[PDB]
Amino acid sequence: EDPSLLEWDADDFRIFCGDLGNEVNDDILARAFSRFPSFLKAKVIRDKRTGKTKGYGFVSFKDPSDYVRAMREMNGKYVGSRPIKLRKSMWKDRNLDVVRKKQKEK
Amino acid sequence: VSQKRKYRQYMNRKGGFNRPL
Amino acid sequence: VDETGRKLTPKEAFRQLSHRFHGKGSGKMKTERRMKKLDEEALLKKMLGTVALLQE
RNA sequence: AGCUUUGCGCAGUGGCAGUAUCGUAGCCAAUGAGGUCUAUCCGAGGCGCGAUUUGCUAAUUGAAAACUUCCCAAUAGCCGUGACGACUAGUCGGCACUGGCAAUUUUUGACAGUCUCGAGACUGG
């Protein structure tokens, strides 16, 4: 249970953006996505001990409505040096995996 | 009886070019 | 043979060889799927006519 | 005092088909769209342009199908023997490891089956 999934969650929607250029995109994702709608949190998963970008990052959006337009207008949009691929965030943690296992037997 | 095969490593080793034992 | 002692099909034998060779295994989801399949086989092999007759 | 008709809105339960559904700060239209049976008769939309859904699950390919490896080492009862020690060549206690532990008193099985009202009987041909 990493203590790093408790910064974006304000009942907001997290878009998981994979296929990111490793050399860049430390904050260029935030620079690109700040235009819509306002200041937000956009992190990049850069593994420690190597400083090498693992690829995927996450972006937190206030509304599902703004998220729809953001996805439809940034899916494949040229960011940094690579086009980005957008999907929904999973955050399959314990409090939800227990419920999933409980539902399985039912 | 039989034992699981014990194969060596080539890529992403951080070790010497030659094999270990 | 796998550690549990089951005869290993050549395909997954080479799968394990390649994993050990490169230095990285399969994902968590694939491991879970594989294990659930193994226990499915065990449950099936370890073993509605009466119900139909009673319901008729 | 209750029954019942029409239009609309909201839900539930079914059937059918995906060559069709939708949009129209574009144009025309009951002051008439459109008429190839069918006309002193009939009577509503037409034309042009534009678009061609989302969540969940299973399965495969592959070395890897994206949500924060191996593997050494290490660690991990009794009878004899060797010392150390204690008590009178003998005895005892603890420790240690360089052989052994399925042949009547024990730890390598006289057990298993049967029958009768907690108790006994029968068989192993």
Side-chain angles (χ1 to χ4, degrees), chain A, chain B, chain C residues 1-47 49 52:
Chain A
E1 287 280 313
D2 267 295
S4 279
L5 292 84
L6 57 169
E7 300 65 11
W8 310 285
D9 216 352
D11 317 303
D12 277 356
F13 200 80
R14 293 179 269 173
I15 180 83
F16 149 94
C17 49
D19 191 351
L20 323 184
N22 61 341
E23 89 301 11
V24 86
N25 212 346
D26 56 346
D27 60 339
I28 289 83
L29 71 173
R31 300 261 50 68
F33 293 9
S34 65
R35 62 147 200 161
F36 196 20
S38 63
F39 66 100
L40 288 173
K41 183 61 174 176
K43 203 188 178 69
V44 54
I45 318 294
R46 189 180 300 277
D47 76 332
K48 57 224 172 203
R49 310 143 299 158
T50 63
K52 270 206 200 224
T53 301
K54 284 192 72 180
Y56 54 90
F58 296 100
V59 152
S60 60
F61 264 124
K62 180 59 141 172
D63 218 57
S65 165
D66 187 337
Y67 140 81
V68 166
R69 172 42 44 209
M71 152 295 299
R72 187 95 88 77
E73 74 202 342
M74 306 147 180
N75 198 310
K77 188 178 191 299
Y78 225 120
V79 170
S81 71
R82 288 188 187 174
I84 39 184
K85 314 171 57 47
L86 275 63
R87 313 286 154 140
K88 288 191 175 191
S89 175
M90 281 315 78
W91 40 258
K92 295 311 193 194
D93 49 358
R94 204 202 212 195
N95 43 307
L96 191 83
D97 88 332
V98 171
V99 178
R100 178 65 243 198
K101 262 153 162 193
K102 270 198 172 61
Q103 282 279 324
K104 175 259 167 190
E105 54 87 24
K106 194 182 296 180
Chain B
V1 288
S2 297
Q3 293 86 13
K4 212 176 171 207
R5 307 289 165 108
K6 326 186 221 171
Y7 301 112
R8 313 173 302 196
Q9 179 172 336
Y10 284 59
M11 334 303 321
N12 327 297
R13 297 168 70 204
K14 294 92 70 172
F17 263 50
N18 321 63
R19 308 272 79 68
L21 271 283
Chain C
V1 78
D2 50 4
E3 61 280 10
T4 185
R6 274 321 320 151
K7 306 296 176 277
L8 228 61
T9 85
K11 173 49 168 291
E12 74 223 282
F14 173 82
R15 171 74 54 99
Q16 170 268 14
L17 174 166
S18 45
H19 279 344
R20 177 55 274 189
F21 173 93
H22 271 289
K24 294 174 179 185
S26 73
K28 308 151 291 315
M29 47 309 300
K30 285 147 192 52
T31 45
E32 301 150 357
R33 175 154 308 169
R34 148 183 190 165
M35 184 175 177
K36 93 187 293 300
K37 265 50 187 181
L38 330 170
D39 47 67
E40 237 188 340
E41 307 321 300
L43 192 139
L44 185 149
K45 171 71 210 163
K46 82 166 287 185
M47 280 291 312

